[PDB]
Amino acid sequence: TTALVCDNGSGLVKAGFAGDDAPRAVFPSIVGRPRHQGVMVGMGQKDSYVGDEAQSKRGILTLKYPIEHGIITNWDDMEKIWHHTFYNELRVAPEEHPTLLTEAPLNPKANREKMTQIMFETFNVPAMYVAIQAVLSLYASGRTTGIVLDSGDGVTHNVPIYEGYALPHAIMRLDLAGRDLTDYLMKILTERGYSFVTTAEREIVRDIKEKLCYVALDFENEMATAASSSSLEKSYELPDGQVITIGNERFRCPETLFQPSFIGMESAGIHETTYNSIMKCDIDIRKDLYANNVLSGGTTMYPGIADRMQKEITALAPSTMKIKIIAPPERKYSVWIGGSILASLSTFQQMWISKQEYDEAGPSIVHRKCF
Amino acid sequence: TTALVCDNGSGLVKAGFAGDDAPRAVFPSIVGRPRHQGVMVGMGQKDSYVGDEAQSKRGILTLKYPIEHGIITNWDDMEKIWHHTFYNELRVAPEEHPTLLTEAPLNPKANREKMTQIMFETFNVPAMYVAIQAVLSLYASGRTTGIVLDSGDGVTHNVPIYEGYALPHAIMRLDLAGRDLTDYLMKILTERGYSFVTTAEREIVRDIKEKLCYVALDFENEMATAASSSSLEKSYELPDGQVITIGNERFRCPETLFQPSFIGMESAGIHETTYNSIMKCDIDIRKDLYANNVLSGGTTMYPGIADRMQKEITALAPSTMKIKIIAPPERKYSVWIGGSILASLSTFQQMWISKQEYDEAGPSIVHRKCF
Amino acid sequence: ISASRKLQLKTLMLQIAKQEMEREAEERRGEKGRVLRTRCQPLELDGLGFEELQDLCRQLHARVDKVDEERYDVEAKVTKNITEIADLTQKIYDLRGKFKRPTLRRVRISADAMMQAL
Amino acid sequence: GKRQTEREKKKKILAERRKALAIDHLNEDQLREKAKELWQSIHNLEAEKFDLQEKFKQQKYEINVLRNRINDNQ
Amino acid sequence: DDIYKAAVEQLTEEQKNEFKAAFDIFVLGAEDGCISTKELGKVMRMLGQNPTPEELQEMIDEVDEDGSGTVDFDEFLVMMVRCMKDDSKGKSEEELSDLFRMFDKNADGYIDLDELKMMLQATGETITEDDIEELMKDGDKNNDGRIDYDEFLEFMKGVE
Ligand SMILES: Nc1ncnc2c1ncn2[C@@H]1O[C@H](COP(=O)(O)OP(=O)(O)O)[C@@H](O)[C@H]1O
Ligand SMILES: Nc1ncnc2c1ncn2[C@@H]1O[C@H](COP(=O)(O)OP(=O)(O)O)[C@@H](O)[C@H]1O
Numbered sequence A, B: 001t002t003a004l005v006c007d008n009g010s011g012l013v014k015a016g017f018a019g020d021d022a023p024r025a026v027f028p029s030i031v032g033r034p035r036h037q038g039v040m041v042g043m044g045q046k047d048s049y050v051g052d053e054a055q056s057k058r059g060i061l062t063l064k065y066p067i068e069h070g071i072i073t074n075w076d077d078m079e080k081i082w083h084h085t086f087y088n089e090l091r092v093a094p095e096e097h098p099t100l101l102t103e104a105p106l107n108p109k110a111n112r113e114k115m116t117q118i119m120f121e122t123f124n125v126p127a128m129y130v131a132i133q134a135v136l137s138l139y140a141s142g143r144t145t146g147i148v149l150d151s152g153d154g155v156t157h158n159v160p161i162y163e164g165y166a167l168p169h170a171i172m173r174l175d176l177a178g179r180d181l182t183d184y185l186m187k188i189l190t191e192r193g194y195s196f197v198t199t200a201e202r203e204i205v206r207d208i209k210e211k212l213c214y215v216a217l218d219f220e221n222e223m224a225t226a227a228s229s230s231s232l233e234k235s236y237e238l239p240d241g242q243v244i245t246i247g248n249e250r251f252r253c254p255e256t257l258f259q260p261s262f263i264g265m266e267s268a269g270i271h272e273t274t275y276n277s278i279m280k281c282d283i284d285i286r287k288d289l290y291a292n293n294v295l296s297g298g299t300t301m302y303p304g305i306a307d308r309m310q311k312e313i314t315a316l317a318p319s320t321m322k323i324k325i326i327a328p329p330e331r332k333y334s335v336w337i338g339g340s341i342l343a344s345l346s347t348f349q350q351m352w353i354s355k356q357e358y359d360e361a362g363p364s365i366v367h368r369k370c371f
Numbered sequence C: 001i002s003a004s005r006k007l008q009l010k011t012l013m014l015q016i017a018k019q020e021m022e023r024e025a026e027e028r029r030g031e032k033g034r035v036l037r038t039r040c041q042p043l044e045l046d047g048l049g050f051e052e053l054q055d056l057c058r059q060l061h062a063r064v065d066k067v068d069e070e071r072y073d074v075e076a077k078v079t080k081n082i083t084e085i086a087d088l089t090q091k092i093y094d095l096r097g098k099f100k101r102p103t104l105r106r107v108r109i110s111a112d113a114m115m116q117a118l
Numbered sequence D: 001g002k003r004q005t006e007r008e009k010k011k012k013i014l015a016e017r018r019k020a021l022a023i024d025h026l027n028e029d030q031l032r033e034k035a036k037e038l039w040q041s042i043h044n045l046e047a048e049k050f051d052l053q054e055k056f057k058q059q060k061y062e063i064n065v066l067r068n069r070i071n072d073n074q
Numbered sequence E: 001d002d003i004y005k006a007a008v009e010q011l012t013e014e015q016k017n018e019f020k021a022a023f024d025i026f027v028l029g030a031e032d033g034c035i036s037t038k039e040l041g042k043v044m045r046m047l048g049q050n051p052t053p054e055e056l057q058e059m060i061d062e063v064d065e066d067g068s069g070t071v072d073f074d075e076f077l078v079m080m081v082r083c084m085k086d087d088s089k090g091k092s093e094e095e096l097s098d099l100f101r102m103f104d105k106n107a108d109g110y111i112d113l114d115e116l117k118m119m120l121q122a123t124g125e126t127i128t129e130d131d132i133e134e135l136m137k138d139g140d141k142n143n144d145g146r147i148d149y150d151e152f153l154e155f156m157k158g159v160e
């Protein structure tokens, strides 16, 4: 039979059968209970709208993501999300399909063990396998080397790989991602008068960020230009009218990636954690990693980031090496495409964690040889 | 049929069919298992890369030479190296070809006996013969007398020969060679800030030594000059950029040959062990040995050694004798060229150790008349 | 340099190549047919005691077994060449699959067409 | 690669292929028929083995072109 | 080559529906008499999905190469093959390997230039600017004159 390549993510759940080009169903991972009282009788009001249904009734819900930073903080809601994904968005019972979840690097063990225990006890799948979210993104590019920066919505991690041999001592995981950029944008919008507070209006700020923000090639020059002319002010129409005008908030929101001091984080930007991740590698594979830097994940879709990052790394790196940044147009679904490719391989067909194996060793089987 | 003139050496395996000018395949003798974990599936990752393949993937391997000082310390790896040499670099099955290995003087017997046992049992050659590495280097020069200093990469030995009669009581074998010079260079580079530690970076230090180091004609004058001017500082580009500048480390690394007290060895330099080897000979053949001093081996390729050695010996020797140092441009492959010449001789064709002879007397046949 | 001329030239030469491939195949067919014909060693089957018959067929059996043994050894040798070919194929597919490894997949099914149902 | 084992497999096949024939368990003409059967079977075996040598030659082609490519990559 | 087999396999289910529907939608007649003998472009327009242009160009040129200028039932099948993916898709790479093996039946370690010389001589195609240029360019893909296996390997591939 065919395998189910699910990809929990944090912000958008992407799923679909193995062997295709794009995920079959992509929908936000939010579960929102209603918060008001409700007076109409017999309206058929449910107790929790999940997935894309709660992005249409969000006016009277309190949306809450079940995955904070890679890790899962609310297991009941995550179980509900998985149940919805299997039964309503794909309509395939899990009793007859292997599953291939994905997990960020350096995550707590208990999260992974609980994930496999749920998949084997509640949904009762035949066999499931958990894979690191960066190796798949490297599969999708058709490479076999390279250092991949997978800046998702929950957590940004940077896994270097050479000739198929991952370097476990050079993984640099940073917890700044799309959600913190949304919060920072929502916080700097208040400097013009627009106040978004409700958890429903966070979605509106996210839409503003997606449609308007861009990464500046040079930050100081853009700050000077936006403060003199008015060629940058782009307007946007809220879900009820009252258009708003975003000035130099456009390139200040995604600039937080390269200067995490804006949101008070100490660490260095995504332009310098990649160079540090390279320098921890051996001295003889640094040229190949320099030449095959891969971008993935949703948050790396800002217009103009593949040039800013290349300029920064070229500034840091030695002058002789060639710096090349691979930015495929299908960046958002790169991890899932790689997952489909991996699940479609014949050599991989014996790596699944078969159910009888789980029955013999318990949920701690995932840390064992079947990784 | 044709004979296979293999030459194990220590650092570079040189092989080729008898009767040519240069070895057919020359490649480092290193076997390196991978050391990291490896995450890509189906990449076709082998368990041990040998020969010149492991000098390209050395970034994720742990290279380890199977021959320490002439002697062989790891028989499985040496067998692997031989198998590679026969099947992939020459592509001739050994079942149909005699072999002519080479061995340093004064080596342990068990090494030679195990070598012949392997060649007769595993590879199953028709007949093999083991020859001393210095007599061949004397063949290649077209002489019949002379004292040859064969400073390889493992061990430096100095065999005097007159009129074809070797003098077994005058062989002076010293264990300082190219590898110790590489280690000493790697140890003195730390005085400028460059630290090479990994077994892969030993190859980079070896390349630095080959391309930059030279032997000073007079040591104190060079030490004084390099400490005042800056006309010696030559720069070199690492495999990733960050050029380095070598100062008076240039002629201090190969100076260890003439003053083995630098690396803590007690013995006298290669300039004085040759004179001692001559003085042990009879009083009537010392003039001929003085006039026909032969250099061979890789490590004698330093620019300016054929003058320093001549100056030193002229200082030691009596003033009347003429001191001449034969330094052919084909020094590195001198032993193998001599091996080809010896294997191509008709008079030598009945000295091979035929397999039936080995079956009758066991591996101890090599010490017998068939030397 | 015209694209049309290049297309004509490659088409004609590729068809010439295909025809020569078929010619090579049929020439090999004739080679093998003649080879089997000349392999046959006819025997004087008549006028022999039936014990001689059994003995002769046993000699045929021995030669047959030895022939199949030679074929076995050469099959093993070509099998080892096959393994080496697999290794070299792995080498080239490594060097190029670093960029084109997942090219094996199933695409273009339902997302591209079924779009307005939702 | 451990020729005792491979030769052992060969001997197992041959002794297996040692389809030894009995005395009063075959007819004289039937014995002729079996002889021709072996004749033709081995003829087909020879054709297959000749094609095998051809494909082995093609394998050597690929070996040389592949290693030459490898050298060009250096 | 694969052209006639692709025409034969056009007798199928998806392409049958495609051809029938295309005729019913935008092959009807009742025009002003302009003679849409070149309705090939009209069908390309009305397809709603244009395939790779090589199908279109080979159909435009090779069909009615005698100047028939007319599309028959069989030519309807040809156009519909041009619509769907009835292509041979680069033929068999096994055929490419076998061809290159026949080329190096001399075993030059690669298809020698004189292989191409004799093959063009057999094909008899006039030595144009494209001729010799293609051969040298493929052999000197390194631009160093050394013909290697992958050079002609990629040169011959992608074609049917
Ligand atoms: N076109 C876009 N431009 C800018 N940001 C985007 C765009 N699309 C998505 N994002 C950001 O990326 C996030 C989605 O990232 P995604 O890759 O789905 O995370 P995950 O790894 O959990 O799947 C969204 O929250 C959004 O903030
Ligand atoms: N051009 C060169 N200049 C200086 N040193 C060299 C040069 N070539 C080789 N060497 C040294 O000689 C060694 C090779 O010696 P070689 O003669 O191959 O040893 P063996 O006797 O084992 O074959 C290398 O390790 C290197 O350190």
Ligand SMILES: [Mg+2]
Residues within 6 Å of the ligand: A009, A010, A133, A150, A152, A153, A297, A298, A335
């Ligand atoms: Mg992700």
Ligand SMILES: [Mg+2]
Residues within 6 Å of the ligand: B009, B010, B133, B150, B152, B153, B297, B298, B335
């Ligand atoms: Mg030597």
